[PDB]
């Protein structure tokens, strides 16, 4: 079952500049940074709060590592802004299988590696009224 | 201080169809619905979780009441998708005054009425790396 908003994925041209804007304007600190070569992103997680299911909610700031990537293509077309939303679950494999059985396109057979060792999948935005939708089980 | 993600604002052509997609696909229920004539929206709040600051996080589904509105114009230009993000605070007036003092454009002098009697303001998306950003104090 999906038990939280895990994160808001925000695409930006310059991660270091955008991280500084969040820190200076709101006082949000960097929880974690990493590069995901498979996804083609340099990412910064800013933790905003903890959640009633035992997890947390983050802003996930993303800069593309290459133009030919999900976020590189999206930035080229749309400019900086919200790229995806992510829901947390204790069992991404089971929740993904249930949602596949409703005819929503699940982009990965098997969950892949996301932030901080998480296991992730995505739902096609054209099946979700225009919202690229991530499912996340934390490590 | 901003202590939670309050909500994700999602623009849609047909609120009743989009609410049904969230209910059928994820099991999310309607927490509240209302019309905001000033903002030009018919809205549905779906509660996803409670938050460590005592508040909650929602999906805010929005259908425009008229074409000449924030959401009507955005839908016309961009199609269905994420429209804004909202941060919760115990004192929207003070947090708005601090952010005004950093040169980020605050759209309302005085917080206005939002969902469930809340007091809200917005930050200009061109000052926030492309993200229309709401500040919310719950009633
Ligand atoms: C690591 C991490 C984490 O949480 O752990 C992350 O979040 S990594 C985050 C980065 N990774 C990902 O996003 C992986 C999942 N995304 C993808 O696989 C792809 O971006 C998708 C969904 C398939 C789309 O393919 P592609 O990038 O090749 O562009 P596309 O040209 O195929 O676009 C197909 C249509 O979908 C629309 N479209 C594309 N990206 C979209 C988005 N982010 N939100 C809403 N709509 C979107 C686009 O406007 C096209 O619509 P029209 O037909 O033109 O109207
Ligand atoms: C009740 C409730 C609740 O929580 O309680 C709600 O949330 S009600 C939610 C609905 N209410 C609101 O959104 C009120 C706040 N929004 C506004 O006042 C306006 O939409 C804004 C920000 C000023 C923009 O003005 P307008 O609608 O007239 O369109 P615009 O043509 O002025 O656009 C100016 C530029 O800003 C860009 N722009 C417009 N809306 C945007 C959005 N949602 N996210 C990111 N960028 C956006 C647009 O692409 C233009 O960029 P280019 O220069 O072309 O690149
Ligand atoms: Cl990697
Ligand atoms: Cl009203
Ligand atoms: Co993500
Ligand atoms: Co809102």
What distance in Å separates residue A118's CA from the closest CA in chain B?
A: 20
Tell me the C-alpha distance between B104 and B81, whole Å. Answer: 24
Q: Quick one: which H or E segment has residue B63?
A: strand B56-64
Q: For residue A50, which of B53, B1, B84 has the smallest C-alpha distance? A: B53
Structure tokens at B14: 């047909």
**B-proximal residues of A, 48-67, CB under 8 Å:** 48-53, 57
Q: Residue B139: exposed, middle, or buried by beta-carbon count in 10 A (0-12, 13-18, 19+)? A: exposed
Answer for the pair A11, A71: CB distance below 8 angstroms, yes or no.
yes
A84 to chain B: closest CA residue: B82
Contacts of A4 in chain B (CB under 8 A): 48-49, 57
Answer for the pair B42, B62: CB distance below 8 angstroms, yes or no.
yes
| Resolution as reported, in Å | 1.8
- Count of domains observed in chain A: 1
In degrees and rounded to multiples of 5, residue A51 shows phi and psi of -125, 155
- B8 CB-near residues (< 8 Å, 6+ apart): A5, A8, A85, B58, B59, B60, B82, B84, B85, B86
A51–B28 CB contact, under 8 Å: no
Identify the DSSP state of A98. H
Give residue for tokens 């089980």. Answer: A137
Structure tokens at A20: 């500084």
Tell me the C-alpha distance between A95 and A19, whole Å. Answer: 32
Tell me the C-alpha distance between A105 and A96, whole Å. Answer: 10
A130 shares contact with chain B (CB less than 8 Å): yes
Radius of gyration of chain A (CA): 15
- Coil, helix or strand for A63? strand
**Strands B41-50 and B112-113, how do they pair?**
unpaired
Identify the DSSP state of A117. G
Tell me the C-alpha distance between A54 and A4, whole Å. Answer: 9
Least CB-CB distance to A2: which of B2, B26, B53?
A: B26
Structure determined via: X-ray
Tell me the C-alpha distance between B28 and B138, whole Å. Answer: 21
Question: Residues lining ligand 1, CB < 6 A?
Answer: A 9, 36, 39, 41, 60, 70-71, 73-74, 83-84, 86, 107, 114-115, 118, 120, 122, 124-126, 130, 132, 134; B 81
Exposure string over A92-103, b if 16+ CB within 10 A, otherwise e: beebbeebeeee
Q: Residue B78: exposed, middle, or buried by beta-carbon count in 10 A (0-12, 13-18, 19+)? A: middle
Length, in residues, of chain A: 139
Q: Can you give the residue range of the structural domain that contains B91?
A: 1-139
Answer for the pair A63, A14: CB distance below 8 angstroms, yes or no.
yes
In degrees and rounded to multiples of 5, residue A55 shows phi and psi of -100, -155
The gap from C-alpha B111 to its chain's centroid, in whole angstroms, comes to 13
Q: Residue B83: exposed, middle, or buried by beta-carbon count in 10 A (0-12, 13-18, 19+)? A: buried
A91: domain CATH number is 3.10.180.10
CA distances (Å), origin B42, targets B38, B60, B65, B82? 11, 10, 6, 16
| Cα dihedral A99→A89→A10→A47 (10° resolution) | 170
- A118 CB-near residues (< 8 Å, 6+ apart): A136, A137, A138, A139
First to last CA, chain B: 17
Contacts of B12 in chain A (CB under 8 A): 129-130
Tell me the C-alpha distance between A90 and A93, whole Å. Answer: 9
Q: For residue A7, which of A32, A38, A35, A39 has the smallest C-alpha distance? A: A32
- Coil, helix or strand for B18? helix
């Amino acid at each position: 079952s999906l038990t939280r908003i895990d994160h808001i994925g925000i695409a930006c041209h310059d991660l270091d500049a955008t991280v500084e804007f969040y820190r200076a304007t709101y006082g949000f600190e960097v929880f974690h940074t990493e590069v995901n070569e498979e996804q083609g992103v340099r990412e910064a997680m800013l933790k905003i709060n903890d959640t009633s299911d035992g997890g947390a909610s983050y802003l996930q700031l993303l800069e593309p590592t290459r133009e030919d990537s999900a976020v590189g293509k999206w930035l080229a077309k749309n400019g900086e802004g919200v790229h995806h939303i992510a829901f947390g679950t204790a069992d991404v494999d089971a929740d993904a299988a249930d949602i596949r059985d409703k005819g929503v396109r699940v982009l990965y057979d098997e969950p892949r590696r996301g932030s901080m060792g998480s296991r992730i999948t995505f739902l096609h935005p054209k099946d979700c009224h225009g919202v690229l939708t991530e499912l996340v089980t934390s490590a």
